[PDB]
Amino acid sequence: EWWKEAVVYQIYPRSFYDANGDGFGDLQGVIQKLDYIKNLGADVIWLSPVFDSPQDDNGYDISDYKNMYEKFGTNEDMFQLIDEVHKRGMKIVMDLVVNHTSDEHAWFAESRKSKDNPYRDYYLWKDPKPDGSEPNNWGSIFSGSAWTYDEGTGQYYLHYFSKKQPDLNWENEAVRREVYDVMRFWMDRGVDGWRMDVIGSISKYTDFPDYETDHSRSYIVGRYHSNGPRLHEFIQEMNREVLSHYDCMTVGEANGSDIEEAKKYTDASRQELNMIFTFEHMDIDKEQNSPNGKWQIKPFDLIALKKTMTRWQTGLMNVGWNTLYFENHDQPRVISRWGNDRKLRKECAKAFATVLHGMKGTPFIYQGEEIGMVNSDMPLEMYDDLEIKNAYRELVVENKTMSEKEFVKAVMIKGRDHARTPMQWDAGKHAGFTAGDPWIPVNSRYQDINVKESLEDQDSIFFYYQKLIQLRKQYKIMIYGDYQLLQENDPQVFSYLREYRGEKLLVVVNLSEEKALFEAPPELIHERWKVLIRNYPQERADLKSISLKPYEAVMGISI
């Protein structure tokens, strides 16, 4: 169970390092930066998808599972990367994207040709309604209908994501076998595990029932879009046929997951996955179900964060396993989203890191999180993401459920592209990401926020992350201790306790810009503490009462 003790670094490779000058990050670029990742201390890398793809969704629309997209390199480069990871004592996890393929995948190019094609039933085709409209009212995550009509055959195909991402038909045993063959091809060549993209969607309600509607919207995304009736059957089959034959790690991107679903995926006795990503803690700052979805912003609410993260810590405390993340290629920079990214940027970045890394589970560090990368001020016309383009058209232009100004404000907070501007290596041109022209501009603050300056500054966010990772490797309590929320009603302070074999770990973090007070509960007042990490310089170990400075974070271990 090395995956319980791991710290994972997520690379978004088109934006990590461009070794050959075309402005697009590449596999040889990753290889050249592996020493940096090892020095940080992560021991597992998760690479976002590098398989051949027309890039409609930046690699999540795969047109060939057994070849690389040419700008990343060739399979030879990928095999070298695997070897280079292993030579450093690290592991590599690839992105398994098997809810859907590109519409340019050979399977779909064949499927769409005719009802008698042998690939027809690789995808999900249905007749129009009598009036020619879509089979039901289901929506795409990327706006509009989940169905697209094919004039040549007279049927619609299903796509939960873009029209260039047709969903695979997992009811067809041949599709499942194709998926297992892909997994074995890569695992036999040294891939150590998989991050499984929208694994929650692979089983459909094959009666395709309409949702109920209150007429706020024409197309609906809801409970049928995940947790289908055969979901866990399929994952159990995948474990029997593939995962059980390798020393591997699996993490599912479990869209639609709540704590009970997480137990189904992650209880070891069920022989499914090791861990899942949930969205519940990322969902605290949207309204529950507006037509504008995640663009219907709410302010950061620490109480909501504490409630949600505590539900997950206690729910998987003695069964299953948690992932721990605040950032990925789909989320904004957490310090910009929920904190201070200006005068208190360092303290705030370190504070969020401490809250997260003090918990039970496997931490994930998204590229640039460890240097305090921030959201971008770029104008809307500079964004790339199809999610944004499609939502602008639907919400602002067509349906008018958001004004222009409100949509721009929402994108500046939550746009996926805040995660995707290039990694900031130094203060030179394009932050040292490329000698050419980057595929999207580097964030305008890069001259102040970059690896070079971080390694020169002993007070950097980088060295704080490096220390959190070292502590996890030294103190078994951080991996295996239980969890108890402390001072639960405090609106500024996120404090909790871990316990393991008579030892205690106290984590106290002021997630606010104002002064706060932590007082230990009565059962803890006679403990003696050794401070393991703090993001301010004043040092005292009487943690029973702490007058917390803005964004102050501290972890102590009992002695």
Ligand SMILES: [Ca+2]
């Ligand atoms: Ca390149």
